[PDB]
Amino acid sequence: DIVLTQSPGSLAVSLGQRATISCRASESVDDDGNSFLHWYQQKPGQPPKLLIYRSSNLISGIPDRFSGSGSRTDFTLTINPVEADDVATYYCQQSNEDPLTFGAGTKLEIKRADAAPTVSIFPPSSEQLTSGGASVVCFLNNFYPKDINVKWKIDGSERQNGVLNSWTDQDSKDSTYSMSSTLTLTKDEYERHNSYTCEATHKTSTSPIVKSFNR
């Protein structure tokens, strides 16, 4: 099983710099001469767009700035200049020996200024509570870099059960992320607690951003 070890896992780059992603095979992917390592670009919601096949062959229509290099174990894709478009995930696949294996992915994201999350917290609508459930939702918005961690405390304890997180992809306009976290309780737990807290921890702040309320 030719494991592939793609790296870096993430690449932050700006419009213009050369991007270089590397894929690394366990063993040779060449039948000596042909190198069966192919590179795929996948934007969110797209099917895999094959870019370059058998090491260095640009598909008919891939903008030439995509170069493919390598041989036997070590291989490289070099996007250069990185354009707005090229933000997507890049995969590499060997097909020299079944089973066919794929590299784990490298997501290339456009770099921008650090921005810290606008956090907003929302108690349950009346409607839900009439229906017998309580969801408390916290939206952490418009922030760069992607790395954030949210923690819910109900009357000062860390509740980490019943929590659903969801992230958007990098925004085309300001190149920021956002995520949403929803804590779901029955109506009954909800009513025997007073303060709900949504606490976020992002590179921009020393120590946490917290939003909270009392019923």
Partner: protein, 215 residues
């Protein structure tokens, strides 16, 4: 000019058999060296190779999966077939039909294995609790929860509110999906202007419009 079209069921209950089909035009499976692969990409994870049938009838399978797979060709109809028995939830993925295992990728076809039935969603307003702040921008939200199957269509003010909106991807919590959207406008805008969450769940033929009203 190599058209590859995968056709399959949509939703299928656990433990059934998944029968997929691939229709190719543009090559022939009798070309020396030819063969067609099925690769699947489970929700959000990366690509997984399933099988490959060769020009010469030699079939190769994924080790892990072997026990459940059966590829087939029918060259007079230009169809490669795949069958997976005893589907379980992990098989929700998008299945792709691929020439030579990498060079021409079909479109994909999503199969979804669930035991849930069509459940129309609950749409709940998410209003703030108050203190005019954050650039004196307010963030308002919409929670759409517990529906099956995907998708729903959330717009704000019938597609007129478009900057500030962040619809987050749906996640599964107990065989049913939950989604939320946040819209951030300035203090001049709400509640002076009405803002409405419009959810449409085509599969149960439901359209719901909730107006976000101060709490």
């Amino acid at each position: 000019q190599v058209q590859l079209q995968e056709s399959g069921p949509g939703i299928l209950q656990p433990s059934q058999t998944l029968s997929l089909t691939c229709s190719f035009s543009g090559f022939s499976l009798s070309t020396y060296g030819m063969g067609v692969s099925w690769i699947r990409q489970p929700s959000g994870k990366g690509l997984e190779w399933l099988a490959h049938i060769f020009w010469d009838g030699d079939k190769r399978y994924n080790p892990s999966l072997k026990s459940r797979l059966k590829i087939s060709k029918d060259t007079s109809n230009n169809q490669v077939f795949l069958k997976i028995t005893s589907v379980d939830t992990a098989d929700t993925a998008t299945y792709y039909c691929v020439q030579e295992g990498y060079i021409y990728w079909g479109q994909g076809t999503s199969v979804t294995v669930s035991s849930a039935k069509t459940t129309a969603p609950s749409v709940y307003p998410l209003a703030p609790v108050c203190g005019d702040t954050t650039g004196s921008s307010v963030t308002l939200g919409c929670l759409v929860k517990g529906y099956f199957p995907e998708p729903v269509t959330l717009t704000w003010n019938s597609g007129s509110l478009s900057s500030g909106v962040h619809t987050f991807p749906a996640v599964l919590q107990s065989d049913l999906y939950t989604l939320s959207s946040s819209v951030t406008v300035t203090s001049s805008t709400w509640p002076s202007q009405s803002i409405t969450c419009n959810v449409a769940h085509p599969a149960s033929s439901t359209k719901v419009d909730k107006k976000i009203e101060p709490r």
